[PDB]
Symmetry: C3
Subunit: 255 residues, 3 copies
Amino acid sequence: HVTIRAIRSEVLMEGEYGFIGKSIPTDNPAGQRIIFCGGEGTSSTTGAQITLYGANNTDSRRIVYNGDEHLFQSADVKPYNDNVTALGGPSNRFTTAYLGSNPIVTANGERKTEPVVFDDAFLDAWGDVHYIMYQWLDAVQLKARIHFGVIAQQIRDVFIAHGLMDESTNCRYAVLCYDKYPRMTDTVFSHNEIVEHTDEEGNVTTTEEPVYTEVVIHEEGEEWGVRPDGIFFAEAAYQRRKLERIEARLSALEQ
Amino acid sequence: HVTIRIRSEVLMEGEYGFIGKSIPTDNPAGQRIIFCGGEGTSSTTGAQITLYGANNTDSRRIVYNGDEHLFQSADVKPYNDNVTALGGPSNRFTTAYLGSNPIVTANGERKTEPVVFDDAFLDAWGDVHYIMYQWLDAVQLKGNDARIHFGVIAQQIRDVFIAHGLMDENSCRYAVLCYDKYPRMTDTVFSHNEIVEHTDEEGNVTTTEEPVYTEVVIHEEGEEWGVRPDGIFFAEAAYQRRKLERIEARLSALEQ
Amino acid sequence: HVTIRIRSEVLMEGEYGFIGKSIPTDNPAGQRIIFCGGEGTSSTTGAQITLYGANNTDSRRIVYNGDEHLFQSADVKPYNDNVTALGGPSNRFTTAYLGSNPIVTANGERKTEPVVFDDAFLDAWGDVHYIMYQWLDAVQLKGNDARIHFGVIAQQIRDVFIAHGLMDESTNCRYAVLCYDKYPRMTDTVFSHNEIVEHTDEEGNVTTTEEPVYTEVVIHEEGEEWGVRPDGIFFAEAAYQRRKLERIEARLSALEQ
Ligand SMILES: [Br-]
Ligand SMILES: [Br-]
Ligand SMILES: [Br-]
Ligand SMILES: [Br-]
Ligand SMILES: [Ca+2]
Ligand SMILES: [Cl-]
């Protein structure tokens, strides 16, 4: 219930550091949060918004960055810690990454077991993997690009046929990755209602209060995925053997 | 303005707090709030996050401006599934540093029936050249010693498809080769302070320093051809598999 | 120090609003503002974003602390083109979850006229080994039941380049497929606890109140990493195996007749 007046309004915080927080709400602690907004209103149609969720909130310690552009200037977009958190998720995939150069994969000092050749039994299986062209039903419905890849289930049906994986829950090989995700809810702005106020004398006045609703973003679910790079490492090992053996049958027969 | 007085604090009560920006009277195209770890409107002063209004020229933009962007305690995720991307045609990330290889999933979205690689597309993929290259500018500095990169030139894969009638001079049936046109990127940025002078009915002339913001071009309109290395390697795996099978064939027909 | 009083509202007028942090009189090195969705200076209290001042030990750092980071209504983008990165040598993302495969583009940047993979290089590439492994970490927690990954060891590929004269036994490498990085240590100023602070009257009376104590921590010490570009590896492997297939076919076409 305050407005900072000015060309520009300024709030300057003194001390060693400044703190702008949200007290534990008296009557609905589950919605505890601050909404920072570039616009006039509590609705995000009003301007860009960043929302910090209190620990007492349904979606606890959540942050939602809401804008039509998220531009990170002057520095890499990094994880705080090394190799603990990820980009995206099973039910939060980015459509793609646009890169100036090919991804770098590294262990950063972390050490592996002793490197091991692709056992022949595994190669026999890998031969049954199919490299296919496909389309999305959704896309074709609107017209539509063809994509190249390998159906996760296709690799899975093969992993089973060759006894490598029990009919997942878990999987021995990271190239085929199964995940199981909860449902994602969020409390978001709906509209502002009119609320009537009448005194004991009986006169009626109105004010505008915003209405927030809990909304489902996506439901519970599971998913199978693959690691293309892993697939290509295995294909490499695969074909190299097919080349080793073919050059033996070329020699014994040349002479 | 207000100033808040070894640590200053602002506690917001109620169910939630709201800190927002009214609609400017005279320049609603500039509607925004600048949050700064420092005392100056200039980002040389401290890390900044700027929320743009809907009225702003750059509607609902967010600019995070710091010398480190460290996201702690949680994955960096898109709000929705398979609707937003990392980077852009003219907003490329140099790379991603990963502890493991990317996971690609369809999360249950439906695909058409998995189809083999036709022999026509395979004949053509045989013309796709794998190559080494260096960046001219690096070559300006280190010449022969400039770092060497691997890949395939987007345009020459385009040429191969066009030659093999799997594409026309337009601008593609395949996801492996992806073209994009992109708008110019502008922003409003702090440049310098400007001394403004204020003179009253009496001759008196006072002085002050107001900050000037200006509209800067970050990049002009352009277009770009690109490729998905993973898509390239899927076509290759197909290609190379057809060849070895013929190799297997030949061989068999030497023991008979 | 103020409190704003179902919802509290601060509203900034003028063209734009500025909310900043003055230069600290005593400890300018801690200059920063902490935004919190919760009641306390501790992050356990709620999601926080900390903006570091230029004067701060960690100059112009931003720290986003939450249990979810959800980016809505727009791609997560770098401000400029091809100058900043996702993750780092000592700040790696475990993975990226995508719906389609990454797009690599040069956006019009000039290249040296592309060259074939030379025979000398292909020769060496043959010694590169494709292997399997587990993380010494995973095993200490899942034993022989830990996930098995595919890839190559950056060191054995280096040995291959070294043994073939393509690379001096020289941290700076000639090919981008093999990445070496040297990195600084990472500290951060972080809330640890509350302390007992004694207050002595001018009459000698000692009262007491608690205040939050921030402390400097070491997130990780300096170090270095060798890494590889899997894509780069496959580009070379596609050139290698193509030359081999070619030599095999010629031996076939010669065997016949
Ligand atoms: Br509103
Ligand atoms: Br599509
Ligand atoms: Br593709
Ligand atoms: Br490379
Ligand atoms: Ca793998
Ligand atoms: Cl300034």
